């Protein structure tokens, strides 16, 4: 019944079309009209079957991929999309991305969303500060979900989007990839500001920057000290650890059998560990 029943041709995309059967929709609704009024479909109570007919017509119209004009309003049609189709998309507006990420909010990242993110970043040429803000907002563990190789392609300018808690899942490899980028982003700052910004990254910092910070009265939180690289705290002197921890040197004895602290103590002489007056023990015996 290719022909559309008389008086049933759709001049407009409205709710009156919900009582059209699938074939009635295929025969009575022109694809260009749908493309122009996509913005109305998400407010109409169309069944999954009728929405399938609609997506079929949208495909008929755009065989080279949808335009962002239609992709912004896809709504729950973005779920009936295939990754192959999304790989042909040119999505540029952050608001389009925010609208598509809101359709499957809460649930785990679907393959469609991964492909959308990849196409978006490959179009923008990088992972921007704004784009990273968006992605972390929708998916909090996004940053630490990237390999140390992928994480290496992040420009330093976008580090201003990385909040401290966004690194509470990153492994030492990722932290080591990130610390230079944050060092560059926060470079050109002065004193307490640099530290306030780089404290959450120092878990991937080397020994040289640690000594440089010690020589500038930083008063490093001991909880931050516990997050440092064991291999990077060993080559430090008692005077350096003292200048770094500032007044927080008191908590050393409380953390005397823990990751970095015990390994550092065991590599120091008791004659110098006793210079702190805190009662530390485990130093290389004199002689």
């Amino acid at each position, epitope marked *: 019944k290719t022909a559309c*029943p008389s*008086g*049933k041709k759709a001049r407009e995309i409205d*709710e*009156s079309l*919900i*009582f*059209y*059967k*699938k074939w*009635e929709l295929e025969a009575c609704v022109d694809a260009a009209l749908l493309a122009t009024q996509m913005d109305r479909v*998400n*407010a*109409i*109570p*169309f*069944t*999954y*079957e009728q929405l399938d007919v609609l997506k079929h017509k949208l495909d008929e119209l755009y065989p080279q991929g949808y335009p962002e004009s239609v992709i912004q309003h896809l*709504g*729950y049609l973005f779920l009936k999309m295939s990754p192959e189709d999304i790989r042909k998309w040119n999505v540029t507006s952050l608001e389009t991305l925010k609208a598509l990420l809101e359709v499957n909010k809460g649930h785990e990242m679907s393959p469609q969303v991964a492909t959308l993110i990849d196409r978006f970043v490959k179009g923008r040429g990088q992972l921007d500060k704004d784009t990273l803000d968006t992605l972390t907002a929708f998916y909090p563990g996004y940053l630490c979900s990237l390999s140390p190789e992928e994480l290496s392609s992040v420009p330093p300018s976008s580090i201003w989007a990385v909040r401290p808690q966004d690194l509470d899942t990153c492994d030492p490899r990722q932290l080591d990839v990130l610390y230079p980028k944050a060092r560059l982003a926060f470079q050109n700052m002065n004193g307490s500001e640099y530290f306030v910004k780089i404290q959450s990254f120092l878990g991937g910092a080397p020994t040289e920057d640690l000594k440089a910070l010690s020589q500038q009265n930083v008063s490093m939180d001991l909880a931050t000290f516990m997050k440092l690289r064991t291999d990077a705290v060993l080559p430090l002197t008692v005077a350096e650890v003292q200048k770094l921890l500032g007044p927080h040197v008191e908590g050393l004895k409380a953390e005397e059998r823990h990751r970095p602290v015990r390994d550092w103590i065991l590599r120091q002489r008791q004659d110098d560990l006793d210079t702190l007056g805190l009662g530390l023990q485990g130093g290389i015996p004199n002689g």
Partner: antibody, heavy 119, light 107 residues
Framework: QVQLQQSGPELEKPGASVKISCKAS????????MNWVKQSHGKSLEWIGLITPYNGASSYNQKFRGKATLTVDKSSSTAYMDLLSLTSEDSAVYFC????????????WGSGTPVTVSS | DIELTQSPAIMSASPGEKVTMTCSASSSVSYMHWYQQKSGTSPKRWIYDTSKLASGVPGRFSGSGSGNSYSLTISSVEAEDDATYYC?????????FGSGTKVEIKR
């Protein structure tokens, strides 16, 4: 099996409002439409509206706009109809019913919620 | 709104008789549905898409029609078919039901 468990009888005073429920069981109601029907004792049937839960979209019989508001909790696979500014004429039995696959009518009906509006 | 008028409003048929009730619409409707309702019960889907019988409906029931006129026919009325039958148009928004045809059994 497919089952539409409706809320219980209701009594409310004029000018008030009530909210009646329809728990769907035996199928994924996210794809189907949920329609609501009114039947006054000794009278025929009257379609109120329908709702799709995936986007919570709703289409109403213009007679019942401003009188019935359809909502859905997908967590519990439940649909709700809120009846507003109750009068005596709103006293009746309200059914929920599932829409067919391709517009094949209402294939599974609820049991009927009685609503009485009186002082 | 499409106004569906059912006729007869009340029908009295002896068991064994063939009976036919009609639903007349104010405008052409693509499809029609027929529900059976027995007192103190929720309506049950009897015929959908004009002529298809729903699961469990006896074969003596049939539905047909087009345009402005649709009909439901019982070949051999049996005492278990006393009830009110409602037609519903699935063409134009909003959905609309018929006033019903009530079927009583002669005895």
């Amino acid at each position: 099996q497919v089952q539409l468990q409706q809320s219980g009888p209701e009594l409310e005073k004029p000018g008030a409002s009530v909210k009646i429920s329809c728990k769907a069981s035996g199928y994924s109601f996210t794809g189907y439409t949920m329609n609501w029907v009114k039947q006054s004792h000794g009278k025929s049937l009257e379609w109120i509206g329908l709702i799709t839960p995936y986007n919570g979209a709703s289409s109403y019989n213009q007679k019942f706009r401003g009188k019935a508001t359809l909502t859905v909790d997908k967590s519990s696979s439940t649909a709700y109809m809120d009846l507003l500014s109750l009068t005596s004429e709103d006293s009746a039995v309200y059914f929920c019913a599932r829409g067919g696959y391709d517009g094949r009518g209402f294939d599974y009906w609820g049991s009927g919620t009685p609503v009485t509006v009186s002082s | 709104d499409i106004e569906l008028t059912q006729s007869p409003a009340i029908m009295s048929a002896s068991p064994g008789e063939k009976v036919t009730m009609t639903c007349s619409a104010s405008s052409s409707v693509s499809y029609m549905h027929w529900y059976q309702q027995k007192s103190g019960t929720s309506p049950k889907r009897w015929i959908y898409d004009t002529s298809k019988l729903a699961s469990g409906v006896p074969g003596r029931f049939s539905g047909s029609g087009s345009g402005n006129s649709y009909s439901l026919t019982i070949s051999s009325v049996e005492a278990e078919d006393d009830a009110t039958y409602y037609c519903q148009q699935w063409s134009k928004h909003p959905l609309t039901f018929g006033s019903g045809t009530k079927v009583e059994i002669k005895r």
